[PDB]
Subunit: 216 residues, 5 copies
């Protein structure tokens, strides 16, 4: 009826007003600082090992990387905006962490839309699907124990004073792993690491993705 | 002609400036997107990586109240063509691609006076597919799901007009002949999330010509 | 040299009155349809892949159309009869290969020539991969392949196509190509498709070629 | 002084770019000088008759709209600026088989007399039959460079020499250069009543 | 926490509203290479592919600020598009550089900037002898494309390439890697030209 039509128009005007009040009325987040540090939660869902190149020692993964963080500057009261509890927005509208593979051999290829979900408590969920080429000797992939390769993910420019990383579990999600991949996964772990490098006194944080796989 | 041109420029200005823009679907304002595939070619089947490359055009249809107009107010313009950047479009994504989709057609949609939008992107898609059996009579079978990347069934529903893939543009001298191609709406509940997720499952059975 | 400053001022004034002081052309309509003339100049068959049935062409595609909204009196603009402009400053037709297997690679600058009668000429050079079975390319008869070109989104009621000639221009064809051209035609076609109710117009590029020996 | 030098350059660029060019015309034609420095023949593909060159292409022209009095801007005689800030000529290979790959920053040098020097490094794949490359006499291939959209009436081309600069050619290339010339040509095509100008790059090379 | 954000936002605003170096306002760029991998060596085309991160440091008076005026903020991370960056270019690449890291730099209160682009580079290299004891040697020069030694000086902190992150299971082992400032007076141009010459000696793992 007209009431239902009015409620939909109101829901749209409420969303437009909330996104306006966060992005127009408030200047985009400048990123974390030693005084305002930020924990990014990382999680990997490994979908496929596409290729293992023994001629270059490069391996190609397809996965989706779940990133979660929380900003005060993104909080709102659902009761002020028609009980809007969350919204979808272009990743370009918000700050996103510079989470980078430390040993890629090619630019990451993005396989999913650059859109995130923002929740009223100011939490952000961003799940980019990627194809990655990284440094990996596949020697042993034709063996019972298979090959093992590792790649570290972390901020490229922020130390542990500004950006901390967390995992919810050290088990890579394999529940979406392609059943007819050329490679079967023997194990996949994601482990937070704290490193002190010689360059700099600040500790650095990464999540180490370790994959054990063999030819099916 | 100059009147017709003025009427279309007025219509586009009314819809894109003078009306507030649509912010995407919500739980309170859900959207149904109709998907259909027209399969043009299986270009390549890589048994070294279990990747298959398809070329198709994907018809996407949806309807917004904010894109409606009365043709009698605009010299009986009943539709127009517009850049996809001008309007909201659904984030329809292959779930098991191995490479970024390559777009083969212009980013232009058709808007009709009832507020319905038709967008027909042609794509080259690399996806996870074991072609084992392609050189046999039974051929190989591969599947890829398509759906919203970021919207659940509470904001975007999917439908097909038919579960038969359109094979009317399938390349007659392809390396691969199609034994069957179906497109089937599926509802799934993942462990992560309590709300339902919707996809369309493209299932292709094919063999060497 | 003073005149040169006036000539530049005139062209800048012309461009400004055409682009800055008007809303960009919204494209053709059923009431105001547009005829685009196409011609292909085939430069090279670079590659014929028998493993995927894809062939790679290099050509430049001449596009010509005419808009009243681009007309000017040369007398009001220091007798300027035409100008070069970025393809981003003007509407251009969405002429698309029907059966490409990869995005077209653009080999020439995105610049067109606008003439005082409102006529535009745009000549994009392209490398195109398209669906083609090269079986018989190593035979006397050679191989035959075809690819249609037309608006992706506009039917025959909004965009009509014509050619000046049904013969592809082979005058620039690379003499030391791996493939020699037996024939190349470009032919207007009016067709109805399963996707859409109204007729669409294309130019069918048909190429018969064989290994150079 | 240094603070004043920055202020002067910023004001000059502001005056040249923000205060004040639509490209050349019949009434205001432009001469572009081209020179090639051939760095490497990377690859010769006898399956497709494509050859890949790496070179830098020196482009020079002079605009009245870019000249200034150095005395009026702290004796600044030249400056570097992004190529996007200025008009640049649409010099195009006539017979490329792939889009040119740009290897150098899109930055030009502008001088107080309004002269501009832009030196893009490029990897180019072009139409070339390398038959004979494995012989003493080697292979010969040629590629024309010129404006895509401007006839000889708007853009004239010049070379300083017909000799391609080989002083930077890669000494351990798979291919040695026997000769490399760059020749201005005036061409009439059946399409067009205006003459068109190109520089014909001709390279004779063999397997080392 | 809200005060720290406010202060950082204010600083960025004040700083961001540089035309590059000049003879009168010259710049020094410090370069250091951290070689991660020789991915492949192509003897059919004499191209080699390196993966490394290139540390770039320079200092501008215009980027200096007093920390006490901005709540003890000693530095900030910013998009490379917000600031001037030097046009450091490989002189003998055969393909455009592929950028493997985010275009973000660190700006410090003294006006210093550190930018560390990770890159994959294809460059001119004959790998002949890579399968011998002596290995193969290749070199590539890095410098400003458009600025002379009058506007941009280049230097290295050390002539030893950092090999401490070199991939242990690379197809190629490094026998030595050096990064050496060179001054060259070309014929065309009376002013000195500065590059850093990256020289890598490598051989197949046995
Ligand atoms: C846009 O579309 C609208 C709606 O289709 C259209 O309005 C319609 O115009 C037609 C023609 O003027 C109208 O048709 C008339 O209907 C009346 C009954 O109401 C008839 O009696 C008329 O018949 C006489 O006139 C005919 C010629 O006009 C003769 O051939 C005939 O023998 C009779 O003498 C006639 O059929 C119609 O009523 C309207 N409809 C509405 C809803 O108003 C409009 O013209 C179109 N164009 C534009 C720019 O808007
Ligand atoms: C995160 C990062 N950023 C820039 C340089 C490279 C790297 C990553 C590889 C190890 C060193 C490093 O530096 C500091 C800590 O980690
Ligand atoms: C559509 C989507 N978006 C983000 C995570 C991955 C994925 C797609 C693969 C299966 C799970 C999934 O999650 C919820 C619905 O489907
Ligand atoms: C040009 C075009 N536009 C949109 C869908 C696909 C296509 C091209 C392939 C055949 C059908 C078609 O539809 C109508 C005309 O031709
Ligand atoms: C320079 C140029 N521009 C547009 C198409 C191709 C070409 C060059 C090959 C011959 C025809 C041509 O067209 C006009 C005159 O020259
Ligand atoms: C840095 C540079 N810029 C433009 C042309 C090429 C190059 C680099 C290769 C050697 C010569 C050179 O020219 C002058 C000094 O250095
Ligand atoms: C253009 O040419 C015509 C005829 O040759 C002449 O009358 C006129 O003065 C010229 N200039 C202008 C500004 O119209
Ligand atoms: Cl944000
Ligand atoms: Cl919309
Ligand atoms: Cl236009
Ligand atoms: Cl200019
Ligand atoms: Cl700066």
């Amino acid at each position: 009826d007209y009431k239902d039509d009015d409620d939909k128009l109101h829901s749209q005007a409420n969303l437009m007003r909330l996104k306006s009040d966060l992005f127009n009325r408030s200047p985009m987040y400048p990123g974390p600082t030693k005084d305002d540090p930020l924990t990014v939660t990382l999680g990997f869902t490994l979908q496929d090992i596409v290729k293992a190149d023994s001629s270059t020692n490069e391996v190609d993964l397809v996965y989706y990387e779940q990133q979660r963080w929380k900003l005060n500057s993104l909080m709102w009261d659902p009761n002020e905006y028609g009980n809007i509890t969350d919204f979808r927005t272009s990743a370009a509208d918000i700050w996103t962490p510079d989470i980078t593979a430390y040993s890629s051999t090619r630019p990451v290829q993005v396989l999913s839309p650059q859109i995130a979900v923002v929740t009223h408590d100011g939490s952000v969920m961003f799940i980019p699907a990627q194809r990655l080429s990284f440094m990996c000797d596949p020697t042993g992939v034709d063996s019972e124990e298979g090959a093992t390769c590792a790649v570290k993910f972390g901020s490229w420019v922020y130390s542990g004073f500004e950006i901390d990383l967390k995992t919810d579990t050290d088990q890579v999600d394999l529940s979406s792993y392609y059943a007819s991949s050329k490679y079967e996964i023997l194990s996949a772990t994601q482990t937070r690491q704290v490193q002190h490098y010689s360059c700099c006194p600040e500790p650095y944080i990464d999540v180490n993705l370790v994959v054990k796989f063999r030819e099916r």
